[PDB]
């Protein structure tokens, strides 16, 4: 039923809930990645506000997509984790029906499809 | 507080629905139109104003026909009329198809008045921009029947809606005392041609063009035909030599 | 076996009271004669599930129609039951006779066949003992008979049927339908056999 | 063709002195094929006991189900579902799937926590509950075992007889039927302790 | 139409916060606290009832320790119906993961689950968020004892100690103080009293307003026991750590 | 046309209230006293029946209404709420229940189950809550006799005795002193015309009081007699005349 | 299985045998036939045995639930109705054929129902494969204005005919009596006349008698 | 925060501004109703009021034929009275259909009640601007009055009155019914009950009414019918000679 | 029908699949793998109706995977095949089922033990120590019922099989163009490429 219309234009050719979920990646823990001639590597601080933690358990922040790729990611965790499942389900996907693996640039093209998606989708941010 | 006038379905605290009352302003904005209860019939009649030289004269007709014993005549914004009309047909036909007899006039105005009642439920529609004057011919006699964008319709002996509603409502009331025993359809013809041309005078800038239609049990079997010819110009002449 | 007949102070319908499973009779004193308004009755021939189920649709579209538009012509309930058995046609084995009185136009019989058709009919003769009968009932019919005639007329033909027709048996019912209002007449075996 | 007759198997419950027993015999064949000879056809839930004869998948379905509903059961109603509500569950169960059923014979056996009264209950493919005191009967040797047990059965057996005469119903029902038999197991119920013993019977 | 009417309980703020999200935060800081301690041999569950009388039947209550399998249970910090909806699914969630693998479902996989539920209700639908925090206490032979918590955000984190509902800056500060990781259960419910002690908006901390669980592996067994302690038995613990 | 409101009309203010929950509190509160009392062998629950008009009969209105057999429901706030909660959970104990275990469900559950009805109006969209507080009494073979008391928000609590509505806070601090719990049936039906004799302003007797008890099985109230285990309903509402008995020993 | 119902002065009787058959197997020696919508309204059922009691506990339902929302005691009537329009609606593919029979404000009412969804009404039904047996006894010994005893007696006679001739039917006899004016009584086993002779030989067996492989323990408890 | 009065959500105060308002609309029309119970009928008198000459005065009603047994009498806007009619009119036909008995009066009351009590919780249906009082000669019950109005609220009356002189007629009918010690009208034929109904109409309005400006229906044992003006002039006639 | 053997040993399971794909008159290919690897230490052989064989296999597998990313960890034999025969089960009441048999062979890294699961299109499972699909069982069961013992090492495993095989040779009318076999233990999954003269 629910198909308003979260994500508009204003006056000035900005659409505020795009540009506000910016916000919420830059108050996001820091993330990293420098690619070298034959590795990359990713690099993600940890916060302090709050420790007593368990360090087995809690959900580290970089994600295997496949054996051969991975998404750290910045902003709201729980999001994170709905991006990251449908990344995981189209590598599958793909490997059944192409009979290979994802390139890194199709899984980031899927993930970057299904951002944009939400951002003119009646009823979801 | 206020905002009571800004959402279709809304009581104000007076217990009135503004949407609704202000529907009639389109309607009491609009062309004059009338109906007259004969003694085995009804006649419609109703003001064409004359934007141009440059409308064809007799072509844009107003009066629309349900079945084939129903007349209906509306004033305010046609399209909502038509609409209207659309949804009578369907009504109509689906009563026919069931129960074979062609619809009862009574039964055939509750399902208008359920349908544009249906229309001040919702703050998702609008009102119906229209008071519809319709009625004809069924088993028991002629019935005419007015109906008002809150869906409220009655019996009326006679009845006139639009821009010059007043002027028709006084001729009609003096119909009403001045024959207790009934016109005929012939006279009330040409009675509703003068009541058009006197109601004409709260619009007298605009030239405009008289359109009459009837439903009579003698003078068209209880089929609803348009007036033509010899019969509309000796009404025309009837009105043209009263208004003088 | 079922039939309706057009007389001179109104209509009248008759029916066996036979319910049969193959060659049991699985009751032999059933109503067949249903009413669907005041003055307006049907008689069912065919499947019991099947008619009954039509004959129970056809009385709550009727008393809707009373509660909105007053009485219904005999016409519109014929029309109500052609319109159920002509659109499930395929689902359907019911042949029902509909019987009306009203005071613009007296007596009305209607017959509504396997196929879902209407047919407008001085007298109609409905169900499988009617074979055995049309012989009969087009030697004896006239038009403008007696309320006394009629019932004869009708008691002699459904009296035949039952002599003849194994899937036929029991009293003859029948309904009455003039301005004075419902009648309902009983004839046993020990009255009808002997004639 | 037959659903009932593809891998055959059995299962009886009787009734005793503050007592019930449900046994069934091993075999899962394919037709002539025996396959394995390891088959259980006897569940538990809490107290309540369920034997399923029949197609072998609807035998498994119906088990991860009853465990399911009779788990779910517990955590909301924070006791042990009794024998007399499970058979409702069993039955409701079996008849929401009247016009695509499970190709089953499920049988019923514990003791009430509540009245100590032994109860027993099988039932048709589509939930027709058979509720006898004396006993109940299931699979491809019916026919066989309803004869064992209208021959051998008395009432009010203590454990150690009930046992005797549940094993010789069995046994001796199971060596006339081409699709039951490889081995068989009997559960003794009594209202504190349950006692499991598997039978030697003929390989053949 | 309805526009006028829509909160819109699925947006950002300027700031990039989720209004709801962080208003049914700040409901859930006045509900009754809850807290999970995890040792090496156990996990404990203790929490306060909010608001109680002489006349609250205490022996067949229970708003704030919920058992979702035999291996997991959940303590609860908010709105109780909102809580039983999200217990009620997660329960399910469990069974439809042993019927189809034969296994017991591992902890975190039931927590991510509930947390992807929660998340929905912030990202699309149009409806408020569940104003609940759970404690999710359980074992697997995957991670052993495990102790997790989860926020109207459809976040969760894992904890050696954790506390949510009122005063949870006051409670985290006191378990930091005397938390160490060679802990034993016993020394665990006495640390989780000690602190609900500290942290209660009443007089004294009495039986009749606590709830109590812990999940042991009894080591006559071999099994893990999930033990809902009745209200004696948090009347005899209350006695023994010297609160009498 | 179509319901277009597809959205919460209860969200969290700044403050964590949720406004309309609150609100239907208030209109609980407005609401007329309605009360609970559980003894050792039975439960009463009890109202006024605040009377629109004196021409209107006030006994073809039932504040105090049969769930099942063993269960009664009773109520404070608005009346039509009621109504059709109790149209819902006479036909949940069935559905979800009666029609799959062949017994009718235990108090706590049916209990359960009106509370989720009671949530969903708190969350679905295009809904207000319920404006009601539940009273719920009832008996099953495995936790015996009960009470229970269920709110706008879905949420519910089992009570030795309590009240809801205009004079809950007197009525409550009444029942506080008389309770203890040795209490016969008899004894509670005392008290609970006590306790309802402080929130009634003008005529007290049968006629103005609807009381009814949870109690002994009513054989002779079944309507069939030849199955033994069969014994009657449990729920039992009091008769006009039963009441002023019980009123002349006040 | 044979069902009779019969209409006497003051009210309506039926009566059923007591056995249950797969096929040709007796499966139940003595199973109540006898079940009731509402409490003053009983059913017998003959045809698919789950049919008959799946829809006899949903129209009993839907009865409970009417009864509450109407404030008014349940009406044979309705049970038809409701009963009639689901079996209708299933084209014959629910295999329940009832005699339903009951008092209510309105009086004494006795109707038959077969799967297609046909109803019957009459003074006196019977139904099952003992039909035919039962329905020549009330054709011969039927008459108007029967007292409570000459309808117990004749509904009886009508299930023994049934029970001695038909072999689909056997075992007991289960009446049930509704008087306008008091409650329904249920006379479970109302005629026994089919007990088993004392067998000749006790087939309990010498201890030990069977060999056993292995024995255990099992965990009920949790 | 200003908007707790367009929709049927609770203000601060636990209040329903849209209900209120709708009962408001009720008296819109300015017509006063009421009904009485006889030994063994029901009848409602309403008040007739044409402004226009030109309407067709035998078109002009606020009293329904529901079903054979059941009427109905309706204080408020016509078009949702008519909408009130027709839905009854439908769920008693359905009714019948369904359970093989004609719908009581205070069960379809019930029905109408339940109907109402919905658009005071759904947002997107508004209540209707009416109140609906249902009469018969219920088989069980006998003689019966049944009212519902926009809150969803509903009960059995020995009498009642509807409209913006109810609170007159009331206290007047009360009043009767203290003297008679009794809770219906002591009167065999129902031309006694329809004289009575009239008359304590005219006493408490303090008005006096020819054939034209009454509205009479009647529910007997198997019928409910409305009267003509000639059946109202004749009771009319009965009254002056006793004054 | 096609050839699908699976044996359990000590510390092993081996699955031995025929190499002959046949439409009507024509063998097609003499080299065809009817297994698929679910997981490191679970391997599942099929065998069935011409299309349904490979697309259910293929399907599992994608499943498997995802799980064990998702996760990061290995199902159990025992769960992989109760999710493979509740797949089926859903399968057998579905508008078109999928006709297709498997063995699943596992080695269980909890447990330290190898695992062999028989499961048939209906969705019935079971646990042997030596299982058969198609006609195959008719001669393999009663040949494994005498030569078989538990304490085996996967070298006597082995020639087991190519007594299984050489019966299978001698006794059934189709030519199945010998079979492919591979070892599931603690070490994974590994093809024994020496079978056709071993
Ligand atoms: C005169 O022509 C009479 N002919 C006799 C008779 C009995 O066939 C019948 O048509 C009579 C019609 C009335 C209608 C009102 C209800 C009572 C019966 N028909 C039957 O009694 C009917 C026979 C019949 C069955 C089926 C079909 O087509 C499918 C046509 C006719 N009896 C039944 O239906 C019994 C009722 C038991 O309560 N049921 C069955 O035979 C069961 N069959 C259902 C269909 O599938 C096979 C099993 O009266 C006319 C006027
Ligand atoms: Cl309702
Ligand atoms: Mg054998
Ligand atoms: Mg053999
Ligand atoms: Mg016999």
């Not at chain 5, 038995?233 to 750590?241: F, G, N, Y």
């Not at chain 7, 009584?185 to 087939?203: D, H």
Request: hydrophobic share 35%.
């Amino acid at each position: 039923g629910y198909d308003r219309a979260l994500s508009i234009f204003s006056p000035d050719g900005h659409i505020f809930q795009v540009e506000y979920a910016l916000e919420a990646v830059k108050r996001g823990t820091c993330a990293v990645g420098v690619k070298g001639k034959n590795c990359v590597v990713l690099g993600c601080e940890r916060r302090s506000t709050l420790k007593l933690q368990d360090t087995r358990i809690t959900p580290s922040k970089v994600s295997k997509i496949d054996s051969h790729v991975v998404l750290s990611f910045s902003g709201l965790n729980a999001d994170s984790r709905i991006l990251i499942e449908k990344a995981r389900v189209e590598a599958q996907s793909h490997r059944l029906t192409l009979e290979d693996p994802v390139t890194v640039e199709y899984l980031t093209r899927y993930v970057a499809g299904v951002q944009q998606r939400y951002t003119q989708s009646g009823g979801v941010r | 507080g206020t905002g009571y006038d800004l959402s279709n379905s809304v009581f104000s605290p007076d217990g009135r629905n503004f949407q609704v009352e202000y529907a009639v302003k389109a309607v009491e904005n609009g062309t004059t139109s009338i109906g007259i209860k004969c003694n085995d019939g009804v006649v419609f009649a109703v003001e064409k104003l004359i934007t141009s030289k440059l409308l064809v004269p007799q072509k844009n007709v107003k009066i629309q026909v349900v079945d084939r014993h129903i007349g209906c005549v509306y004033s305010g914004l046609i399209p909502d009329g038509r609409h209207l009309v659309n949804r009578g047909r369907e009504e109509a036909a689906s009563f026919k198809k069931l129960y074979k007899t062609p619809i009862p006039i009574p039964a055939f105005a509750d399902r208008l008045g359920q349908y544009v009642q249906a229309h001040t439920l919702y703050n998702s529609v609008r009102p119906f921009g229209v008071s519809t004057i319709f009625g004809g011919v069924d088993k028991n006699g002629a019935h005419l029947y007015m109906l008002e964008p809150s869906g409220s319709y009655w019996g009326y002996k006679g009845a006139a809606t639009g821009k010059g509603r007043q002027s028709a409502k006084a001729e009609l009331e003096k119909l009403v005392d001045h024959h207790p025993e009934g016109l005929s359809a012939r006279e009330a013809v040409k009675q509703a041609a003068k009541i058009i041309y006197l109601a004409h005078e709260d619009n007298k800038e605009k030239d405009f063009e008289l359109e009459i239609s009837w439903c009579s049990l003698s003078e068209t079997n209880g089929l609803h035909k348009f007036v033509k010819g010899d019969l509309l110009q000796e009404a025309i002449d009837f009105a043209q030599k009263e208004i003088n | 076996t079922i039939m309706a007949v057009e007389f001179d102070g109104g209509v009248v319908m008759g029916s066996d009271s036979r319910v049969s499973a193959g060659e049991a009779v699985v009751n032999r004193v059933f109503d067949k004669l249903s009413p669907l308004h005041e003055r307006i009755y049907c008689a069912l021939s065919g499947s019991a599930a099947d008619t009954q189920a039509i004959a129970d649709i056809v009385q709550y579209h009727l008393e809707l129609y009373t509660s909105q538009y007053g009485t219904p012509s005999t016409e519109t309930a014929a029309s109500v039951f052609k319109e159920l058995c002509y659109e499930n046609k395929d689902n359907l084995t019911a042949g029902i006779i509909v019987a009306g009185y009203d005071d613009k136009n007296k007596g009305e019989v209607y017959t509504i066949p396997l196929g879902g058709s209407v047919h407008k009919l001085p007298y109609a003769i409905a169900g499988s003992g009617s074979t055995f009968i049309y012989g009969y009932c087009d030697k004896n019919f006239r038009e403008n008979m007696s309320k006394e005639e009629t019932v004869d007329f009708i008691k002699h033909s459904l009296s035949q049927a039952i002599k003849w027709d194994g899937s036929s048996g029991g009293v003859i019912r029948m309904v009455v339908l003039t301005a004075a209002g419902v009648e309902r007449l009983i004839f046993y075996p020990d009255e009808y056999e002997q004639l | 063709s037959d659903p009932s007759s593809i891998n055959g198997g059995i299962v009886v419950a009787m009734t005793g002195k503050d007592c019930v027993a449900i046994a069934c015999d091993l075999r899962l064949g394919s037709q002539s094929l025996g396959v394995s000879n390891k088959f259980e056809k006897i569940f538990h839930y809490g107290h309540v006991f369920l034997g399923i004869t029949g197609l072998a998948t609807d035998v498994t379905t119906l088990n991860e189900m009853f465990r399911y509903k009779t788990n779910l059961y517990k955590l909301k109603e924070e006791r042990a579902i009794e024998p007399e509500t499970f058979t409702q569950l069993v039955s409701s169960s079996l008849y929401e799937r009247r016009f695509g059923p499970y190709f089953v014979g499920p049988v019923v056996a514990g003791i009430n926590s509540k009245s100590g009264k032994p109860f027993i209950a099988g039932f048709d493919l589509i939930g027709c509950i058979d509720e006898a005191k004396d006993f109940i009967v299931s699979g491809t040797a019916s026919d066989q075992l309803f004869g064992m047990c209208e021959s051998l059965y008395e009432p009010n057996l203590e454990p150690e007889d009930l046992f005797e005469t549940i094993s010789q119903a069995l046994l001796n029902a199971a060596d006339r039927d081409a699709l039951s038999g490889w081995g068989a197991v009997v559960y003794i119920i009594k209202k504190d302790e349950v006692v499991k013993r598997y039978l030697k019977m003929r390989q053949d | 139409g309805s526009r006028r009417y829509d909160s819109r309980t699925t947006i950002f703020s300027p700031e990039g916060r989720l209004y709801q999200v962080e208003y049914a935060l700040e409901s859930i800081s006045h509900a009754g606290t809850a807290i999970g301690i995890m040792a090496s041999d156990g996990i404990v569950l203790a929490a306060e009832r909010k608001v109680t009388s002489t006349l609250l039947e205490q022996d067949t209550s229970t708003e704030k320790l919920y058992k979702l399998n035999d291996k997991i249970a959940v303590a609860v910090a908010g709105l109780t119906a909102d809580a039983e909806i999200l217990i009620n699914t997660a329960r399910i969630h469990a069974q439809n993961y042993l019927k189809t693998y034969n296994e017991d479902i591992p902890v975190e996989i039931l927590v991510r689950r509930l947390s992807d539920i929660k998340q929905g209700y912030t990202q699309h639908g149009g409806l408020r968020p569940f104003g609940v925090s759970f404690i999710y206490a359980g074992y697997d032979d995957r991670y052993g004892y495990q102790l997790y918590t989860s926020n109207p955000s459809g976040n969760y984190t894992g904890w050696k100690a954790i506390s949510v509902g009122a005063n949870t800056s006051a409670a985290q500060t006191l378990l930091q103080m005397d938390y160490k990781d060679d802990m034993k259960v016993d020394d665990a419910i006495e640390l989780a009293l000690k602190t609900l002690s500290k942290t209660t908006d009443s007089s004294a901390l009495t039986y009749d307003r606590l709830e109590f669980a812990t999940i042991r592996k009894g080591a006559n067994d071999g099994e893990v026991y999930q033990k809902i302690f009745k209200p004696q038995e948090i009347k005899d613990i209350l006695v023994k750590t010297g609160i009498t | 046309m179509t319901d277009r409101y597809s959205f919460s009309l209860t969200t969290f203010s700044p403050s964590g209230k949720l406004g309309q929950i609150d609100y239907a509190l208030t209109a609980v509160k407005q609401g007329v006293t309605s009360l609970g009392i559980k003894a050792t062998n039975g439960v009463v629950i009890a109202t006024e029946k605040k009377s629109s008009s004196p021409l209107a009969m006030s006994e073809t209105l039932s504040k105090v209404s049969l769930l099942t057999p063993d269960i009664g429901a009773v109520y404070s706030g608005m009346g039509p709420d009621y109504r059709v909660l109790v149209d819902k959970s006479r036909k949940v104990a069935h559905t979800s229940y009666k029609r799959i275990y062949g017994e009718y469900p235990p108090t706590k559950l049916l209990v359960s189950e009106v509370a989720k009805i009671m949530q969903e109006a708190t969350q679905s969209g295009g809904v207000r809550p319920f404006g009601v507080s539940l009273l719920i009494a009832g008996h099953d073979e495995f936790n015996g006799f009960s009470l229970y008391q269920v709110d706008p928000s879905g949420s519910y609590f089992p009570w030795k005795a309590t009240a809801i509505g205009k004079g809950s806070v007197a009525a409550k601090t009444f029942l506080e002193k008389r309770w203890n719990d040795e209490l016969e049936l008899e004894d509670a039906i005392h008290i609970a015309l006590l306790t309802l004799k402080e929130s009634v302003e003008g005529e007290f007797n049968g006629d103005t009081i609807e009381l009814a008890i949870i109690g002994d099985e009513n054989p002779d109230l079944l309507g069939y007699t030849g199955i033994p285990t069969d014994k009657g309903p449990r729920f039992r509402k009091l008769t006009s005349q039963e009441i002023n008995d019980r009123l002349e020993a006040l | 299985t044979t069902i009779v119902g019969v209409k006497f002065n003051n009210g309506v009787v039926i009566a059923a045998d007591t056995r249950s058959t797969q096929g040709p197997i007796v499966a139940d020696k003595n199973c109540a036939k006898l079940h009731r919508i509402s409490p003053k309204i009983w059913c017998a059922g003959a045809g698919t045995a789950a049919d008959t009691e799946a829809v006899t506990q949903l129209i009993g339902s839907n009865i409970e639930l009417h009864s509450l929302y109407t404030s008014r005691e349940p009406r044979v009537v309705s049970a038809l109705q409701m009963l009639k329009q689901h079996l209708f609606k299933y084209q014959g593919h629910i295999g329940a054929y009832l005699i339903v029979a009951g008092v209510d404000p309105t009086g004494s009412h006795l109707f038959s129902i077969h799967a297609h969804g046909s109803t019957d009404v009459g003074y006196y039904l019977s139904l099952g494969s003992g039909s035919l047996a039962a329905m020549a006894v009330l054709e011969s010994h039927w008459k108007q204005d029967l007292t409570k005893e000459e309808a117990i007696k004749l509904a009886s006679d009508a299930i023994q005919a049934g029970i001695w001739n038909d072999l689909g039917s056997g075992s007991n006899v289960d009446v049930c009596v509704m008087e306008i004016g008091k409650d329904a009584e249920y006379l479970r086993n109302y005629l026994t006349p089919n007990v088993r002779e004392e067998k000749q030989k006790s087939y309990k067996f010498p201890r030990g008698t069977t060999a056993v492989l292995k024995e255990s323990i099992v965990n009920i408890c949790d | 925060a200003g908007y707790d009065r367009h929709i049927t959500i609770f203000s601060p105060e636990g209040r329903l501004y849209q209900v209120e308002y709708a009962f408001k609309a009720t008296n819109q029309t300015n017509i006063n109703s009421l009904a009485v119970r006889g030994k063994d009928c029901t009848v409602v008198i309403s008040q007739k009021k044409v402004p226009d000459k030109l309407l067709d005065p035998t078109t002009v009603s606020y009293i329904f034929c529901i079903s054979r047994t059941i009427g109905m009498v309706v204080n408020g806007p016509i078009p949702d009275a008519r909408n009130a009619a027709l839905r009854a009119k439908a769920e008693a036909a359905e009714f019948r259909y369904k359970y093989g008995y004609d719908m009581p009066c205070d069960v379809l009351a019930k029905r109408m009640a339940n109907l109402s009590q919905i658009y005071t919780q759904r947002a997107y249906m508004r209540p209707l601007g009416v109140i609906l009082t249902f009469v018969s000669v219920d088989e069980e019950l006998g003689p019966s009055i049944y009212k519902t109005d926009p809150a969803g609220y509903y009960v059995g009356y020995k009498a009642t009155a509807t409209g913006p002189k109810q609170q007159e007629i009331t206290t007047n009918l009360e009043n009767h019914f203290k003297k008679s010690k009794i809770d219906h009208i002591n009167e065999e034929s129902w031309e006694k009950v329809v004289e009575f109904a009239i008359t304590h109409m005219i006493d408490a309005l303090g008005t006096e009414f020819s054939k034209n400006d009454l509205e009479v229906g009647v529910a007997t044992k198997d019928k409910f019918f409305t009267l003509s003006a000639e059946n109202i002039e004749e009771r009319l006639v009965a009254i002056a000679e006793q004054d | 029908m096609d050839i699908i053997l699976g044996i359990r040993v000590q510390d092993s399971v081996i699955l031995a699949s025929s190499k002959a794909v046949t439409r009507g008159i024509s063998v097609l290919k003499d080299s065809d793998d009817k297994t698929r690897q679910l997981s490191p230490h679970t391997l599942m052989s099929f065998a069935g109706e011409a299309g349904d064989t490979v697309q259910f296999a293929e399907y599992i597998q994608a499943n498997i995977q995802l799980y064990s990313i998702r996760e990061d960890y290995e199902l159990s034999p025992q769960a992989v095949s109760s999710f493979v025969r509740q797949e089926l089960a859903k399968s057998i009441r579905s508008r078109r089922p999928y006709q297709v048999n498997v063995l699943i062979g596992g080695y269980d890294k909890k447990k330290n033990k190898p695992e062999l699961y028989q499961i048939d299109y209906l969705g019935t499972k079971v646990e042997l120590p030596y299982g058969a699909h198609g006609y195959s069982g008719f001669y393999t069961f009663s040949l494994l019922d005498h030569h078989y013992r538990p304490d085996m090492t996967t070298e006597e495993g082995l020639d087991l099989l190519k007594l299984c095989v050489q019966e299978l040779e001698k006794r059934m009318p189709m030519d199945f163009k010998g079979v492919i076999v591979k070892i599931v233990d603690k070490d994974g999954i590994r093809q024994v490429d020496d079978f056709q003269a071993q």
